[PDB]
């Protein structure tokens, strides 16, 4: 609703979405199949500025969630049903260090935005007592 409140809430939502994507990727570092039988392709969120009516500055909105285009890892298990004619099973391209660092940075941004929102709310509470 309130601008800075809108900005902080949108940014909290975006950082929570990034953290959830990173956690799901970290869970699926060793996953070999999904429901359809396709390999799990790592997800990554896309951030975009939410300043549609606010010129060039605004909140951050998650435009989409996209499968990373890094090449899939290949493991030689010719007995696996998912192995192709060459005997290679496709395993996800999830980078463990990148996901851990993403989780940590997203947590820090989340906390910073919460502190910003608290300070702004306190400032309006004090504004509510102008002239008295």
């Amino acid at each position: 609703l309130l601008n800075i409140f809108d900005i902080a809430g949108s940014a909290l939502a975006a950082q929570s979405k990034r953290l959830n994507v990173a956690a799901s990727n970290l869970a699926n570092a060793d996953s070999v199949t999904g429901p359809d039988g396709q390999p799990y392709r790592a997800k990554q969120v896309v951030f975009q500025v939410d300043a549609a009516p606010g010129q060039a500055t605004g909140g951050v909105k998650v435009a989409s969630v996209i499968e990373s285009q890094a090449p899939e890892k290949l493991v030689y298990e010719p007995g696996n049903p998912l192995a192709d004619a060459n005997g290679y099973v496709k395993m996800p391209n999830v980078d463990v260090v990148g996901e851990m660092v993403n989780t940590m940075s997203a947590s820090r941004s989340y906390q910073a935005n919460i502190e910003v929102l608290n300070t702004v709310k306190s400032m309006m509470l004090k504004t509510l007592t102008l002239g008295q």
Partner: peptide
């Protein structure tokens, strides 16, 4: 605009 935040962007990539 913007792209993938975090690990994927802050990693060297082949020029394209």
């Amino acid at each position: 605009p913007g792209g993938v935040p975090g690990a994927l962007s802050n990693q060297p990539a082949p020029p394209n």
